[PDB]
Design a protein around this ligand. Structure first.
Ligand SMILES: Nc1ncnc2c1ncn2[C@@H]1O[C@H](COP(=O)(O)OP(=O)(O)OC[C@H]2O[C@H](O)[C@H](O)[C@@H]2O)[C@@H](O)[C@H]1O
Ligand SMILES: Nc1ncnc2c1ncn2[C@@H]1O[C@H](COP(=O)(O)OP(=O)(O)OC[C@H]2O[C@H](O)[C@H](O)[C@@H]2O)[C@@H](O)[C@H]1O
Ligand SMILES: [Mg+2]
Ligand SMILES: [Mg+2]
Lengths: 195, 195
């Protein structure tokens, strides 16, 4: 019953724009909202993908591969699932394997993919596909993985035991000022709440 | 290694603002970034809280209480954990219990509270505390929950089986084309991966 009436551009940069949204509520009344949008968004599937990479090795606990990097908006370092924007004509799964191999050097296999999900719905229209990727750590292909980083990209690879993820994330946070991503934390929490 | 050099306000609304961030990368080179920030953030406190409401009943497996509402930035409806911005001086735990009761009518008990985690670090400095709350669904008091939304709030309550959360979320996305929150989905995936 609710829908968008109009979007008034407020300010637009090279990557992000801010606009005043006018919409109709359930009572037929008009209301406004301040919304954010990436200017690099196409009429594709989503702004990007986030990869949940599960490193598997026989006789070993599984490991979750994460990345640490400085995030200007946060003014500090953050612990996140590897992620990146998608390419035209590229499938979410294709981008996931590509982003994973580029940031971590690992070559994985698609386990499953999510529909487009929202990053922060009360603020922006940003969406991503969360792609679960398993990595055969016993394959020579993944013996010594080498990441292909671009210019201006300084990412650190951190692998943590999946069987104790939440506590291991807490331990990392106890060593220095670090912010764990909400999707990573939600994931770690569910692993404990499940069983 | 890396650090903020300055933050220049580009545009500012009543709720959201856009800034130009200048920072130094590892090589010593000055780079820039377009960052988003909420104008309502109190000092020394995350922007808000997301509540993971665990409905517990003697004759049933646990349920996760979620809410569905129209999100202007998304131009459509979203399925999320109950959430709200934190009032000044209000504890994350109190904001969570209050928000859950207001949006769903359930009175819960604190189980745990996470440190501040980021929503979308590549875009904004927004953070929240993920607060796990248990609800005694057999208490007469929770027999027929009645919410009490504030100014212009139209939120719908949707409780789903924790044991089959992922599948149940996919159905809703296909049946009504709406969008699931990335944290809700990340949580659902781990529940599945653990089981
Ligand atoms: N707001 C911005 N300001 C300046 N440059 C930007 C911005 N957004 C994107 N860019 C440029 O595009 C590049 C995209 O790099 P990716 O690795 O593909 O994307 P990433 O920054 O990791 O974002 C992927 C996801 O994570 C974050 O939560 C982000 O909001 C997105 O949802 C950035 O490194 C940068 O050069
Ligand atoms: N960007 C905005 N534009 C217009 N009004 C806003 C905005 N942000 C907040 N408000 C006003 O403040 C109110 C805050 O309501 P809450 O329930 O306390 O917060 P909510 O909007 O649910 O946000 C909490 C969290 O959940 C979402 O992921 C959102 O992005 C945020 O991180 C909104 O209903 C609205 O009136
Ligand atoms: Mg990246
Ligand atoms: Mg809310």
């Amino acid at each position: 019953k609710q829908y968008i009436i109009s979007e008034e551009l407020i300010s637009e940069g090279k990557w992000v724009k801010l606009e005043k949204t006018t919409y109709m509520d359930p009572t037929g009344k008009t209301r406004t909202w301040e919304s954010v949008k990436r200017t690099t968004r196409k009429e594709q599937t989503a702004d990007g993908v986030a990869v949940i990479p599960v490193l598997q090795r026989t006789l070993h606990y599984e490991c979750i591969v994460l990345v640490k990097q400085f995030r200007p908006p946060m003014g500090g370092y953050c612990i996140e699932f590897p992620a990146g924007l998608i390419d035209d004509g590229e499938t979410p799964e294709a981008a996931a394997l590509r982003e994973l191999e580029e940031e971590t050097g690992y070559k994985g296999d698609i386990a499953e993919c999510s529909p487009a999900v929202c990053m922060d719905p009360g603020l922006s229209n940003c969406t991503i596909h969360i792609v679960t990727v398993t990595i055969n750590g016993d394959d020579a292909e993944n013996a010594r993985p080498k990441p292909k980083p671009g210019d201006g990209e300084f990412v650190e690879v951190i692998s943590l035991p999946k069987n104790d993820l939440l506590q291991r994330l807490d331990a990392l946070v106890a060593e220095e000022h670090l912010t764990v991503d909400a999707r990573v934390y939600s994931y770690a929490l569910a692993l404990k709440h499940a069983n």
